[PDB]
Structure 1
Amino acid sequence: AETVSFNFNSFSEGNPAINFQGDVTVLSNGNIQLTNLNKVNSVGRVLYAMPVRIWSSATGNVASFLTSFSFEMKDIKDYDPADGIIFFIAPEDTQIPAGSIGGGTLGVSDTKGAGHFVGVEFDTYSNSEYNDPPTDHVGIDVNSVDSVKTVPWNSVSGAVVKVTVIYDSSTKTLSVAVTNDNGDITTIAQVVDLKAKLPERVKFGFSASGSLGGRQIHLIRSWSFTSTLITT
């Protein structure tokens, strides 16, 4: 079996295991702040430096993975709390879209909301142009921020949220369990064929964005990950 696993309880600038793209900054408390509160259309992304091989063209096998992370979003004065965070999987050459308008593209798509990635978004602003539901929500995104499926959610300012994701290769099912501050859990699941949507080598990471009038604090506090590919 081919296994990749890492665990981050705190991040630090200068660690070769992590890639920073955009307005990302590492706070003194070990947290990663994804966007810059003073920039228009800010965009920040963090990726695990080493590309992970999720499927083999030789065998035809796809990998299974278990990952969990916790984040925090907090409101700032005068600005609309937007736009959210997205945990994504993309090709190893992934870069912030050229001329990204930030906002509802979450730093992973173009103006139409199209891109090459698969991810789970924690959207805190309803962009009608992308057919966003009228409330905060969690959604599964396949090559577009126009979610394949969404579930109502509630973003609480200053609350630490915990997420657990499981991808079962056999069924090609991606299931998410979000544990809110008050104890309640929110789940969403969807069948996504990674082998057909992404290349053999990909990179995992987080991304967040803002606009001119919409800005808020987007923090990533911890992240653990394990993937196992059957090499036989």
Structure 2
Amino acid sequence: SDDLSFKFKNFSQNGKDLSFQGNASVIETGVLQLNKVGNNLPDETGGIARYIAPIHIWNCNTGELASFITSFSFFMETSANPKAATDGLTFFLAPPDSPLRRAGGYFGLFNDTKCDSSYQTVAVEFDTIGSPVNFWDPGFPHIGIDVNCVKSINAERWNKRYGLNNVANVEIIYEASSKTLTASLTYPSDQTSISVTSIVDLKEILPEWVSVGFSGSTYIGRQATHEVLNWYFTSTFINT
């Protein structure tokens, strides 16, 4: 496909256009839940949920690159210590058939801290627990752009909020010509915005076709669930 766009205003439990891995799934309240909390989960648990059809990210014959924009609102819920809750969620591009890996601080995308070009992953993380708990991260909750590694290229301090009472709207735009990836988180209750920009050439990083989706993880003791409220996306090789 050259152009693609799909909007989910809700999420039905009988959906047929989303593949889930780990313990992610749509729930009765029509919410896309990325990770389950409570008992009977491994110490590092989480889930991935991606659009069933692989996106045509770049064309190897024309050399053309596709620009894209995606928006979604998510909220988080925790029972105990919020400031100490792990680990967050992610929006990512990767080979559509990539397995679910290590959860917790690795979000399900990476199996350890070693950076490897073979991941062909580009994720915009919303990390809720950093150093010293998560060594490789800055000393505070934040947002970052992950390129083939759990360690961001660039990041921004995020003062995380929990509860349905604090829904966050995210919007990511990747400008193909300037290779600029910009993601912003905005708490609508008060317009508390934040954004992390970066210049990454997806043509070098990602494969011809990739999946676009989400991932969410937490940790025993510091459990919290991360869930998507809706989603929008639009790809296009043909400029604007």
TM-score using structure 1 length: 0.92
The alpha-carbon deviation at position 112 of structure 1 amounts to 2.4
The alpha-carbon deviation at position 113 of structure 1 amounts to 5.2
The alpha-carbon deviation at position 216 of structure 1 amounts to 0.3
> What residue is the counterpart of 1:190 in the other structure?
198
Deviations 1:86-118 (A, max 9, x none): 111101211102xx2x21101110122546110
Is 1:76–1:217's contact at 8 Å kept on the other side of the alignment?
no
Unpaired runs of 5+ in structure 1?
none
Pick the aligned partner of 2:145 from 137, 140, 145. Answer: 140
The alpha-carbon deviation at position 127 of structure 1 amounts to 4.3
Pick the aligned partner of 2:182 from 165, 175, 188. Answer: 175
Is 1:130–1:145's contact at 8 Å kept on the other side of the alignment?
no
Q: How does 1:109-188 map to 2 (within 5 A)?
A: 109-112=110-113, 114=115, 116=119, 117-128=121-132, 130-158=135-163, 159-180=166-187, 181-188=189-196
Is 2:13–2:28's contact at 8 Å kept on the other side of the alignment?
no
- Give me the whole-angstrom Cα distance separating, in 2, the residues matched to 1:161 and 1:88: 18
| RMSD over equivalenced CA pairs, Å | 1.8
> What residue is the counterpart of 2:231 in the other structure?
223
> What residue is the counterpart of 2:34 in the other structure?
34
Deviations 1:117-147 (A, max 9, x none): 1011000001445521111100011011101
The alpha-carbon deviation at position 78 of structure 1 amounts to 6.5
The alpha-carbon deviation at position 65 of structure 1 amounts to 0.5
1:88 and 2:89 aligned = no
* Seq. identity, %: 38
> What residue is the counterpart of 2:8 in the other structure?
8
Is 1:175–1:189's contact at 8 Å kept on the other side of the alignment?
yes
- Give me the whole-angstrom Cα distance separating, in 2, the residues matched to 1:151 and 1:43: 23
TM-score using structure 2 length: 0.89
Q: How does 1:46-61 map to 2 (within 5 A)?
A: 46-61=49-64
> What residue is the counterpart of 1:214 in the other structure?
222
The alpha-carbon deviation at position 211 of structure 1 amounts to 2.0
SS in 2 for 1:196: helix
The alpha-carbon deviation at position 57 of structure 1 amounts to 0.6
Output the amino acid matched with 2:93.
I
SS in 1 for 2:139: coil
- Give me the whole-angstrom Cα distance separating, in 2, the residues matched to 1:157 and 1:12: 24
SS in 2 for 1:42: strand
Aligned length: 228
Is 1:105–1:113's contact at 8 Å kept on the other side of the alignment?
no
Answer with 76-85 or 55-64: which moved more. 76-85
